[PDB]
Amino acid sequence: MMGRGKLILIEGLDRTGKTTQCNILYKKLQPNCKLLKFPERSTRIGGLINEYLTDDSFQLSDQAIHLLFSANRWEIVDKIKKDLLEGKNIVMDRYVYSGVAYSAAKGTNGMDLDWCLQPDVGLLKPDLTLFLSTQDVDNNAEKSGFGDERYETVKFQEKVKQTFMKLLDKEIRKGDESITIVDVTNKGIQEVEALIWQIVEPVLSTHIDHDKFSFF
Amino acid sequence: MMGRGKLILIEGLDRTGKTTQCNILYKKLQPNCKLLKFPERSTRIGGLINEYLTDDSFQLSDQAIHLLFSANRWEIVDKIKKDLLEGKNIVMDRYVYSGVAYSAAKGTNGMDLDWCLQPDVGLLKPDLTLFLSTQDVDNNAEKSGFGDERYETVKFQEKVKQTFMKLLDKEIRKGDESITIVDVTNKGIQEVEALIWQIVEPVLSTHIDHDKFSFF
Ligand SMILES: Cc1cn([C@H]2C[C@H](O)[C@@H](COP(=O)(O)OP(=O)(O)OP(=O)(O)OP(=O)(O)OP(=O)(O)OC[C@H]3O[C@@H](n4cnc5c(N)ncnc54)[C@H](O)[C@@H]3O)O2)c(=O)[nH]c1=O
Numbered sequence: 001m002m003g004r005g006k007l008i009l010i011e012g013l014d015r016t017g018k019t020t021q022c023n024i025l026y027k028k029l030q031p032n033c034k035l036l037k038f039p040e041r042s043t044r045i046g047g048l049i050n051e052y053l054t055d056d057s058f059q060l061s062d063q064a065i066h067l068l069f070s071a072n073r074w075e076i077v078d079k080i081k082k083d084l085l086e087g088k089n090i091v092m093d094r095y096v097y098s099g100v101a102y103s104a105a106k107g108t109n110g111m112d113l114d115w116c117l118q119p120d121v122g123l124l125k126p127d128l129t130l131f132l133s134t135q136d137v138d139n140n141a142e143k144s145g146f147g148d149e150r151y152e153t154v155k156f157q158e159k160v161k162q163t164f165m166k167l168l169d170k171e172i173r174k175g176d177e178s179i180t181i182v183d184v185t186n187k188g189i190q191e192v193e194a195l196i197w198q199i200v201e202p203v204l205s206t207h208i209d210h211d212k213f214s215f216f
Numbered sequence: 217m218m219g220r221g222k223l224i225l226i227e228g229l230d231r232t233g234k235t236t237q238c239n240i241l242y243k244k245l246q247p248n249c250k251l252l253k254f255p256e257r258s259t260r261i262g263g264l265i266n267e268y269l270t271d272d273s274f275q276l277s278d279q280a281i282h283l284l285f286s287a288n289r290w291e292i293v294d295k296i297k298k299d300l301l302e303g304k305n306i307v308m309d310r311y312v313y314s315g316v317a318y319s320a321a322k323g324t325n326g327m328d329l330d331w332c333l334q335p336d337v338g339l340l341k342p343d344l345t346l347f348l349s350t351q352d353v354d355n356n357a358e359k360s361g362f363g364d365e366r367y368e369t370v371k372f373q374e375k376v377k378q379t380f381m382k383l384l385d386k387e388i389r390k391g392d393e394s395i396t397i398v399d400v401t402n403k404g405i406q407e408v409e410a411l412i413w414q415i416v417e418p419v420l421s422t423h424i425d426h427d428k429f430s431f432f
Pocket residue numbers: 013014015016017018019020021038039053069070093094095096098099100102103141142143144145151152187188189190192
């Protein structure tokens with residue numbers, strides 16, 4: 001009996017169409033759906049992350065920016081949970097996985113997968129996590145804007161690639177099957193969209209106890 | 217002998233003469249000494265923390281503000297380390313213990329001593345930590361301006377007290393010998409100043425193992 005909305009998470013490297021697919025899925029699931037994107041640049045903490053990403057001159061240590069990315073989710077997670085309990089579904093672009101992967105890829109002393117994950121521990125786990133994977137480097141043909149932000153380098157993006165796999169393989173081989181890797185190499189928007197609904201549709205029908213959640 | 221400066225930390229509840237004592241100690245060790253106080257409110261992250269402490273309209277989740285406090289130390293730690301290596305002592309008012317104890321005192325689900333400590337893991341440990349303890353938390357709430365900040369209520373300071381005790385007990389019993397509790401109950405500035413010097417002086421002269429650093 002009963003039930004709550006589902007939290008659908010789409011993750012992946014930069015320039016892999018995630019915002020695109022999320023808007024599609026969100027439009028598809030409306031009106032009983034919410035859309036959320038991290039970093040959520042509209043809050044003060046979000047603005048700081050924004051400045052950091054858009055201006056590679058804004059100075060901030062790896063650990064400080066890392067914790068800001070995580071506080072950005074904590075400042076929003078209560079609304080997320082309120083929506084889910086109201087039965088609404090939530091499509092989310094980027095979350096804890098991006099948090100850990102991007103920072104740990106830096107290889108900064110003391111900032112290993114484990115350290116990077118701790119600040120997010122206790123946050124709601126998404127009901128389904130789609131990882132849009134690709135073998136297409138930075139991908140000029142997928143730039144989501146001008147000049148290109150701080151992390152958009154082929155070398156670094158290549159680093160986050162490994163870290164993303166290592167982290168996911170871990171939690172997968174660890175017993176988590178709510179994570180699906182989707183190869184989107186050379187796939188157009190409609191195609192990738194079809195591939196995603198094939199995974200998401202079934203989850204939306206599956207029943208979840210309104211009072212039951214998983215956490216990081 | 218010549219070597220690296222020492223990182224001296226003074227901790228305690230609100231209105232326990234820490235600022236006072238830190239300046240006194242700082243003046244004592246000059247010219248070769250720096251004074252640092254946390255939260256360091258002059259940075260952007262520092263500014264948000266200040267607004268949180270001074271403005272009840274400023275809403276931020278317990279986990280979020282908790283991570284800002286930690287990030288605020290991370291944006292300064294490279295300086296601390298560099299100064300010490302240059303041979304400068306550093307007197308610091310509040311640090312990681314204040315971070316853990318204040319947030320964990322809240323009793324917020326999932327925000328326990330261990331969770332609270334994680335973001336600070338990797339940070340330089342002070343060579344010496346002095347905890348100014350008072351038994352009269354009731355008169356603490358008498359000082360002028362007491363109540364103007366968020367954590368300034370007798371009942372909450374009560375909770376922070378218990379938390380600080382738990383946290384220092386754990387660290388001391390675990391084997392941290394660099395932590396000293398100083399009973400400052402009903403003692404004046406000069407007496408407390410004398411009690412602090414008695415502990416600090418000897419440390420300034422020692423030069424443990426190749427001047428190596430310790431970390432949280
Ligand atoms: C949450 C979090 C994030 N980050 C970092 C990761 C990032 O480096 C940075 C900004 O992350 P962001 O998600 O705001 O980044 P965006 O600027 O939004 O863009 P991305 O590079 O991730 O873009 P998307 O992957 O969403 O791409 P999208 O906006 O959908 O598309 C870009 C363009 O390509 C086209 N396109 C889309 N799909 C296409 C397809 N199938 N084939 C061809 N072209 C396609 C689109 O129409 C658009 O023109 O934040 C962390 O380091 N830690 C954290 O904790």
